Design a protein around this ligand. Structure first.
Ligand SMILES: N=C(N)c1cc(-c2ccccc2)c(Nc2cccc(N)c2)s1
Ligand SMILES: N=C(N)c1cc(-c2ccccc2)c(Nc2cccc(N)c2)s1
Ligand SMILES: [Cl-]
Ligand SMILES: [Cl-]
Ligand SMILES: [Mg+2]
Ligand SMILES: [Mg+2]
Ligand SMILES: [Mg+2]
Ligand SMILES: [Mg+2]
Lengths: 236, 12, 236, 12
């Protein structure tokens, strides 16, 4: 633990500074350090953790796709042999991406998920677990691809089950989970019908619960509902 | 790749 | 040399891939590796080197300014003592920025500048030397600030002298040097009049040489001329 | 900070 000598509160403060500076790798390292203090995370702290790693892995995913596309072109019929470099460098980026995913899954497994008893924490972390398995799945091509996919599904499904029992249909965490699980279905599980059904049902059940909310909660819920709608527009 | 909407920072 | 075992040509190829993937830290490390092969760089290779490090140091400069601004606010009259974290983290970023600048200056000194005899290479590298000293100057506050500033000026001045003797007034390297030296004057040397005079004279002498150029060279020169004009608009 | 125009990538 490179952050082992820094106070928890200082790590959180520095994570917030890092976010303002758009230094997401630093933000992620500070939040990793905070998690490794062993105390449970507050709502705000969970959001900092997620934002940091989401930004880091996002850069790597975008880079991977660029490189993958080039590599695929280099293997078309009529493309000139450019040598091993494209593959080597796509592998380098892929391996770093996988390391980031393993790091996050490691924090969730040691010991964020097992100590999370409230619905809002447990659903948040299990959604994250599904998400980072999904990012692994996006780059997986080996004999482990099926098990990675099944790990994503399993985490998403446990999260869905708790969210349906314990949260209202407008809960932004619940909505965000459904959004992400629907995308999992669509393009990881090759289940577009399931994707569409989940997104529709989720949208419709939130719509019918909006009347219960404050103006501020209404804004939070309708933001994610619009994402469901955006995908449904592309899918139907 | 056409990327669909997922929660949070669209950082990719 | 982490890149010591990779072929020069492969490092260059990977630098180009890294650029397409917006992986500038990788791009910089690959070009560092290429330089350390000890051969002189071509025009394209010099541009890859410059772009890579410019992108890296650019992120650090933007982050430094965010943090510096917060720190300065925290030291205003009526601001609550937030402890040492803001300063510590601004220092962390500053130190990394300084490392990147030292790395680039190290490559220029060992041995890019001394082997560069053609005007287009020698002016390019001396401009870079001025630029990275300027980035050091932006964050310098110690008893070395004056010497850093003088190092920037000295490098810029040698570049200017060669550029005026050996290049036409529309040469994009010459124009880019003058642009940057003018900004040095304006906000590092506290010499706004010198900044304005240099930018004006440079613009006017390029304007009068445009008639000699092809359409493509005309585009290249007028792009940088517009930057001179943009600053002059802000300055007058 | 108002940053003036300098050559190349405006990466800051
Ligand atoms: N980028 C960041 N630092 C954060 C984003 C969000 C956020 C808010 C709404 C929806 C999704 C994410 C945070 N949430 C936050 C803050 C204080 C308290 C509580 N409970 C939760 S922190
Ligand atoms: N981002 C990059 N890979 C490059 C940018 C520029 C460039 C061009 C014009 C003006 C400023 C920068 C390059 N220059 C280049 C290319 C081939 C040959 C030669 N001679 C020069 S490479
Ligand atoms: Cl590589
Ligand atoms: Cl720090
Ligand atoms: Mg691999
Ligand atoms: Mg159907
Ligand atoms: Mg310092
Ligand atoms: Mg005057």
């Amino acid at each position: 633990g490179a952050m082992g000598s820094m106070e928890r509160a200082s790590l959180i403060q520095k994570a917030k500074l890092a976010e303002q500076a758009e230094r997401y790798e630093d933000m992620a390292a500070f939040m990793k350090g905070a998690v490794e203090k062993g105390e449970e995370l507050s709502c705000e702290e969970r959001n900092l953790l997620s934002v940091a790693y989401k930004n880091v892995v996002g850069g790597q995913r975008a880079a991977w796709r660029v490189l993958s596309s080039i590599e695929q072109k280099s293997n078309e019929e009529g493309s000139e042999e450019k040598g091993p470099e494209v593959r080597e460098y796509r592998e380098k980026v892929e391996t770093e991406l996988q390391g980031v995913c393993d790091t996050v899954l490691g924090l969730l497994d040691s010991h964020l998920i097992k100590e999370a008893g409230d619905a809002e924490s447990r659903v948040f972390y299990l959604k994250m677990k599904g998400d980072y398995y999904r990012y692994l799945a996006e780059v997986a091509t080996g004999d482990d691809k099926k098990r990675i996919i099944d790990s994503a599904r399993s985490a998403y499904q446990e999260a869905m089950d708790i969210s349906k029992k314990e949260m209202p249909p407008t809960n932004p965490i619940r909505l965000g989970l459904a959004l992400n699980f629907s995308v999992f279905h669509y393009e990881i599980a090759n289940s577009p019908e399931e994707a569409i059904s989940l997104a529709k049902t989720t949208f419709d059940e939130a719509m019918a619960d909006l009347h219960t909310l404050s103006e501020d909660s209404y804004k939070d819920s309708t933001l994610i509902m619009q994402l469901l709608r955006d995908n449904l527009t592309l899918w139907t | 790749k056409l990327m669909f909407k997922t929660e949070g920072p669209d950082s990719d």
